[PDB]
Amino acid sequence: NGGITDMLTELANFEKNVSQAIHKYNAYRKAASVIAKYPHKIKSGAEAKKLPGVGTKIAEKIDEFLATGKLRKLEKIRQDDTSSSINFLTRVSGIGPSAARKFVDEGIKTLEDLRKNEDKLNHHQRIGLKYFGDFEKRIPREEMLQMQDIVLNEVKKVDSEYIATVCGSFRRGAESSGDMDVLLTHPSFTSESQPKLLHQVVEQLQKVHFITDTLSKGETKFMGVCQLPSKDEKEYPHRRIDIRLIPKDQYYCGVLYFTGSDIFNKNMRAHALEKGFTINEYTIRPLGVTGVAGEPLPVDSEKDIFDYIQWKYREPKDRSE
DNA sequence: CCGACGGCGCATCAGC
DNA sequence: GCTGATGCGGC
DNA sequence: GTCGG
Ligand code: NA
Ligand code: NA
């Protein structure tokens, strides 16, 4: 049904980027999604409305797509110079809906236009602009392994006692990634515990020209850009990388959460509820009889998390659902 | 019929 | 100058 | 825009 899920996703983005209606953005995603995983060529909009998250207005949109191969509102909005430009510019990392709009108000509508107006961009947006196309490229697993090597090596070299895990879908065995998400902890850093801990790891990864730019950086979260060293060969794209410092006693919660997937964490947070628990990125708590959660139970490996909700450890390899 | 639809870090703005 | 709000990213 | 209370 690619005709329909593209439509729905195209519609999704205009809501986010142009109407600034976050909830309609998601409404449309949920429907793309449910339809994307639905094992039949959809014959009518009535057929589709059965699926949860497909309601009346989308049902009519299907019906118009199916009969005519388009949507009047969609064609119409694609040709709108203002709107289609506001939508496009938000593709630059650091330009969201508010800033894309303000730009288009003053005539800034293309990358070119941003290029001639560097002075009206903030740090984040220059970097987004500069790597506009690298940022939209995927990363092969191979390159990810090559990147993992560099990070794990360099972290251990700052302090042998650090623990770093690369999570995301890559940890789940995914053939390609969108960025690198690194979770970093250290025994001297607990919920009750230097401002140097994240800084020293970033410092090292810059020293060896692995980290090339900085989107933002604090005591507990770094977001920026990285690049494998070029092998006589054509150089590697610049890649998004984030790095987070988590307290040693919340790491394995972090690791699980930042491993996903979504569809996984839903079921697990709905099973945790069944066997009576509440499980966030930081902690698991045992809810009371009215619904008053008490003490976050300790966690010391990915293993634990499962014992507490009574489950057989699922390997990251198959955590799609 | 009408409110929920998520939280949090950091950079940067708006208000005192 | 300080605090708190808002934009953003993207889980 | 959809759902559900
Ligand atoms: Na975007
Ligand atoms: Na953007």
Domain boundaries of chain A, sorted by first residue = 1-80, 81-137, 138-257, 258-320
Residues 6 or more apart in contact with residue A318 via CB below 8 angstroms: A172
Count of C-beta atoms within a 10 Å radius of residue A140: 12
CA triple A274-A278-A276, angle to 5 deg: 30
Find tokens 């142009």 and name the residue: A18
Report the catalytic residues of A.
61
User: What 3 state SS string does A103-154 have?
Assistant: HHHCCCCCHHHHHCCHHHCCHHHHHHHHCHHHHCCCEEHHHHHHHHHHHHHH
DSSP letter for each residue of A169-185: TGGGT-SEESSEEEEEE
Experimental method for this entry? Answer: X-ray
Nucleotides of B under 7 A from a protein CB: 4-6, 9-13
Sign of the dihedral through C-alpha A281, A284, A285, A286: positive
Domain A1-80, second-level architecture: Orthogonal Bundle (1.10)
Torsion of CA A55, A56, A61, A66, to 10 degrees: 90
Q: Which amino acid is at A281?
A: E
Structure tokens at A125: 């947006």
A49/A47 Cα distance (integer angstroms): 6
Q: Do domains A1-80 and A81-137 have the same CATH topology?
A: yes
Domain A258-320, second-level architecture: 2-Layer Sandwich (3.30)
Give the three-class secondary structure for A221: strand
Query: Residue positions of A in the annotated binding site for dATP?
Result: 138, 169, 172, 178-179
Resolution in A: 2.5
Query: Residue positions of A in the annotated binding site?
Result: 49, 51, 54, 90, 92, 95, 138, 169, 172, 178-179, 181, 242
A237/A260 Cα distance (integer angstroms): 26
Give the three-class secondary structure for A318: helix
Element (DSSP H or E) covering residue A156:
helix A141-158
Name the pairing type of β-strands A211-217 and A239-245: unpaired
CB A286 within 8 A of CB A293: yes
Domain A138-257, second-level architecture: 2-Layer Sandwich (3.30)
Given this structure, which CATH class describes domain A81-137?
mainly alpha
A13/A87 Cα distance (integer angstroms): 7
* Nucleotide with the nearest C1' to A57 CA: D1
The reply to whether the CB atom of residue A84 sits less than 7 A from any atom in nucleic acid chain B is: no
